[PDB]
Each structure stands twice: as C-alpha cells, then as structure tokens.
Amino acid sequence: GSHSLRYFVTAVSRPGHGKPRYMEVGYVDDTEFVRFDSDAENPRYEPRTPWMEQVEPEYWEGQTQIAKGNEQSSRVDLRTALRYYNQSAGGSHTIQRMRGCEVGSDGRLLRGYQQVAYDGRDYIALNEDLKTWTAADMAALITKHKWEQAGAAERDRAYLEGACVEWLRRYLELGNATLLRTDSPKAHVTHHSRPKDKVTLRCWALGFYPADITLTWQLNGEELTQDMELVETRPAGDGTFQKWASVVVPLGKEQNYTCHVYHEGLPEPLTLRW
Amino acid sequence: VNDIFERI
Amino acid sequence: MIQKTPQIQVYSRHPPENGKPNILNCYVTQFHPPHIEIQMLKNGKKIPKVEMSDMSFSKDWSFYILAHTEFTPTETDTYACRVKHDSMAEPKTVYWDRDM
C-alpha cells in the first residue's frame, strides 16, 4: 500500500461578532495526528495520537508558527473572496484547502496535490503536473494569474516532493507500530420480516482497520445492486470501522443470496449465507 | 509538516 | 452558496445486548456549512456526558462530526440523536434501531 500525508484546513467567517475561526488538521493514511484550532487562547498545534507526543519540542514551535501565518492569510482570503464574487456583506462563508502526498512503498511520490474550495465548492486545484493550475470558475482565474505570477506552483511542487515526502516517511516511522496494523472485519447476516412476504437480509462488517472495504450481495449470479441499500463506512469509535449492506428478498428465497466481504486484513474473502 | 499557503 | 443536508447514522460500537455496557455513536456527515448542533437523547433528555469531535471535513469538502457517549441498552429505553442545521427547515431526529 501507498501512504499519504494530507493537511485539511478550514476558515469560517462568523457573521456579526467573532472573527474568522481557523482549523488545520493533518492525517497520515487518514488517521488524524496533528490539529490546530483557532478558538483556544492557547492556540497551538498539538499531537493527536500517542506517537506524535514523542516529538522534539521545537517541532511544534515551527508548525504553530506556520499556522498563525496561515490563519492570518485566511482572514484576508475570506475578505478577498467576498470581493471576487461581489457577495452581500453580512454572511458566514468558508474557505477550505487540502494538500498532501501519496507515495508508494518504494518511497517515491505517486501524487501531489493542493486544492482550495470556497463556500463548499471547487475553486482552484494544482494539476498532477505540479506546475499548472485549474480554476473552477471566473473568480478563481484571478487567483490563477496571481499564482502564475507569484511562482506559487514551484513552491508547492518543492514542498510536495520535498518536505512532505521526508516528513510522511518520518511520521510512519514514528507511529509505525500502529498505522501499519491491519484488523480484519467480523461479519454476520441478520434477518428481518417485511410487509407482503418480503425479507431484509443485512450483511454486517465490524471491527475492521483500515476503513477500505467492499460489501456486495450476490444473487447467485455474481452481480447485484438493483434494490441494494448500503451505508457509508462509519467509525465504531475505537480505531475500527463498520459498514453494512442490505438487500430485500422474496420470503422463502433467503438461501439463494450470498454476502461477500473484501478487505485487506483477510487471508481470503468471506462469503456468508443466511 | 504543513507549509505557508499562497493568498488567493 | 449551496447547502448540503447532514446524513445521520446512530449506532453502537458493539452489537447490542440488553444490559450490556457499550457505546453509542451519532455520526453526522456530508453537510455544509459547518455550523451544526448535535445532541444525543435518552428518553427525550440530552445525555449529559457526550463526547464530540471537532470540525473536520472530507475529501469532497463536506463536513463530519462523530458524537458518542457510553450507554447500556435495555428493553425499555430509547436513544435518539437530534440535529439542527441550516439546510433543514426543522431539527431532525434519528432513533437508534438495533438492526442498523
């Protein structure tokens, strides 16, 4: 498996009173490990897993610094945004950013990226080529020309191939004995009566890490989706995940339906039958 | 580690 | 400004068995803007000690929050989760149902 280091950042202009809040969250392989949060009095980056607490005192000094920088720019970006879109003056708005790296297990960069969204929608995104931008709309074109003029693209490209890789690799080593673990899902099928002589079979997957999984119901013919409800993968809140997938069957015909669970923490894929 | 973000 | 309506799942960390200490989660996802109000109920009363995650969002830009609180299920206790968001004209409740 490849791995990622991603930062997800949010700026929210509060209506009348308040100033913008600002939040900076970073994730190694989709596990949170550092957070920064504007509302605190003691606004500081902080460890979010046990293995980041082991880190050189001045790591934080450094990261906190950058956060205040970015915080300040956010305030300004929000005001800029407002003027690009000619928006009514009184409302609550949002700027969000994501950037990070996925690198293979051989240690080479796979994809680097950085995207901004305004009020929940795509604004601008660095292209996979790491040197051209994609504007989502006419306001973002203003920024794109700014960033083209400011050589922004080169600075991000340098960080993505530079600091992020180096640090990704370095965070893995730190919490190496946890982010690499693999818990396999425990599955069962439940049964439920239904109006008209219909039956909900529901296929459960519990206790798995990492989150990625595939639950499918096959009517002995491999393919099945028509009338097949499944929920988004959800955290059980102990480090593991949960998911289920249900299907409705004519009463009497339960045995014809098999559930299949694919997950990387399994010797081999489970099949289940009521 | 995170970096500085360009202003939009 | 486009709003996205929160999606709500109420569910327990382990498969419920009456009388059995356990944990209750109320997972709220896919909303925007980020301001939101969440409460967990037990027979129509905020459960006092509810732990809540901080504002965070997904690769599609949409916000999530997980709330959870320790509970212990029984024949005669219902558990809900109530959520208030701008995208909804009314607060929305979701009851914990052991089969979901």
Question: Residue A37: its chain C contacts at CB < 8 A?
Answer: 54
CA distance A123 to A142: 11
Q: Judge if the upstream peptide bond of residue C33 is cis by omega within 30 degrees of 0.
A: yes
The residue of chain B with its CA nearest to that of A164 is: B1
* Residues of chain C contacting A, Cβ within 8 Å: 1-2, 4, 7, 9, 11, 13-15, 23, 25, 27, 29, 32-35, 54-57, 59, 61-62, 66, 68, 99-100
Q: How wide is the angle at C-alpha A23 spanned by C-alphas A22 and A27, nearest 5°?
A: 160
How many angstroms from the chain centroid is the CA of residue A233?
Answer: 12
Cβ within 8 Å of residue A30, ≥6 positions away: A4, A6, A210, A211
CATH homologous superfamily of A182-272? Immunoglobulins (2.60.40.10)
State the smallest CA–CA distance between residue B1 and chain A in angstroms. Answer: 6
Give the number of other CB atoms < 10 A from CB of residue C23: 17
Question: Residue B2: its chain A contacts at CB < 8 A?
Answer: 7, 24, 26, 63, 66-67, 70
Adjacency order of strands within the sheet including C37-42: C37-42, C79-84, C92-95
CA distance C79 to C42: 5
SS3 A140: helix
A77, two tokens: 């970006």
User: Taking Cα atoms as reference points, which of A33, A65, A68 lies closest to residue A51?
Assistant: A33
In order of their start, the domains of chain C are 1-100 (2.60.40.10)
Resolution in A: 2.5
State the smallest CA–CA distance between residue C44 and chain A in angstroms. Answer: 24
The residue of chain C with its CA nearest to that of A116 is: C61
Decide if A94 and C66 are in contact by the 8 Å CB cutoff.
Answer: no
CB C88 within 8 A of CB C5: yes
CA distance A53 to A162: 24
Q: Judge if the upstream peptide bond of residue A210 is cis by omega within 30 degrees of 0.
A: yes
A140-149 and A152-161 helices, crossing angle to 10°: 80
* DSSP string across chain C: ---B--EEEEEESS---TT--EEEEEEEEEEBSS--EEEEEESSSB-TT-EE---EE-TTS-EEEEEEEEE---TT--EEEEEE-TT-SS-EEEE--TT-
Domain positions in chain A: 1-181, 182-272
Q: How wide is the angle at C-alpha A108 spanned by C-alphas A104 and A113, nearest 5°?
A: 85
How many angstroms from the chain centroid is the CA of residue C49?
Answer: 14
Decide if A23 and C1 are in contact by the 8 Å CB cutoff.
Answer: no
Exposure pattern of C32-52 as b/e (b: 16+ CB <10 Å)?
bbbbbebbbbbeeeebeebee
Tell the residue number behind the tokens 């400011």, with chain if given.
A150
Whether A1-181 shares its CATH topology with A182-272 is answered: no
Q: What is the CA radius of gyration of chain C?
A: 14
Tell the residue number behind the tokens 């970015």, with chain if given.
A70
Q: Does A171 touch chain B (CB under 8 A)?
A: no
Decide if A237 and C55 are in contact by the 8 Å CB cutoff.
Answer: no
DSSP state letter for A51: G
User: Taking Cα atoms as reference points, which of A216, A10, A51, C49 lies closest to residue B5?
Assistant: A10
C81, two tokens: 């989760």
Decide if C54 and A35 are in contact by the 8 Å CB cutoff.
Answer: yes
CATH homologous superfamily of A1-181? MHC class I-like antigen recognition-like (3.30.500.10)
DSSP state letter for A11: E
